[PDB]
From TrEMBL, chains A, B:
Protein name in UniProt: RidA family protein
Record Pfam families: Ribonuc_L-PSP
Gene3D superfamilies recorded: RutC-like
Taxonomic lineage of the native organism: Bacteria, Pseudomonadati, Pseudomonadota, Gammaproteobacteria, Pseudomonadales
Entries under CDD domains matching the protein: YjgF_YER057c_UK114_like_2
């Protein structure tokens, strides 16, 4: 009784297992912009996915952040550090990575809870 | 007498915690072939591992795919995109990475359910 | 409800969801040391975090290991092999990665169980 969302042959965007939510690699739908813009797009899409299963921004457990360029780290954090409800930031791990599309400045992978 | 010198690797292959399955990084047993062959080997090993604990290919939650070479992306997907039952692909995040053994074309890290 | 530990705007060091423990990216507090030193520092901080919630190093489920330099692989594994009770080491996946601070030789990301009522 795994529930899946936005499913194609290649992937589900999201899978729910009991009360645990898995969200696969998230990138900006419009990767033409800067790190701040792409970060915001990804976080907003995460908001939308979470709301669709009865979760929310305060229920995130872990985020893996794959960052394309070191120079973008401050801009990533500018958006991220203002985002989560007070005292409810998830665990986080950010490193540099080579992503499939050279336009992507960042990719996130998420585990969350659903009450 | 005889003295034996070996390289011995004792791998934590899987850990089960209630109804969630964590699989250690998986690579091809025989990494001499192309991306298609290596991808097939790893997915087949995942079938065997999941079978052994009462899970299956339709119960995968997340797969992190670490691809060694950009040129192998299409070949990875050629196999992957035909693998999963309809509506049952896991969440996925693929990026390029330098792997421990230069022979490996891909490594996969799996979380699955056993219901 | 989720319980979080060592929380700032940027991150919680640890989040507990029922009996599953998530610990975020762990790097050495003092990164001037070699791979063995940094690996020990990281595993000790993981130990402290786990025990604070009633888990322990025999209850880890997965560790993602991001290694900065190929020549450090043997040193990482030397400590790893000295650390965990026989047969109870967690699943792992190690690859080479560029980390944010060039001084960091390794970074680990952890999922663990919190089973029993073990006091530390």
């Amino acid at each position: 009784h795994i529930e899946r969302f936005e499913v194609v042959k290649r992937r589900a965007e999201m899978a729910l297992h009991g009360n645990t939510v898995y969200i696969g690699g998230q990138v900006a739908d419009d990767p033409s912009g800067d790190i701040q813009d792409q970060t915001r797009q990804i976080l907003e899409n995460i908001d939308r996915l979470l709301q669709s299963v009865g979760s929310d921004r305060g229920q995130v457990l872990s985020v893996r952040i794959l960052l394309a360029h070191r120079e973008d780290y401050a801009g990533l954090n500018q958006v991220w550090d203002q985002w989560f409800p007070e005292g409810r930031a998830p665990t986080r791990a950010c490193s540099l990575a080579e992503l499939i599309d050279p336009r992507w400045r960042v990719e996130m992978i998420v585990v969350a809870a659903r009450e």
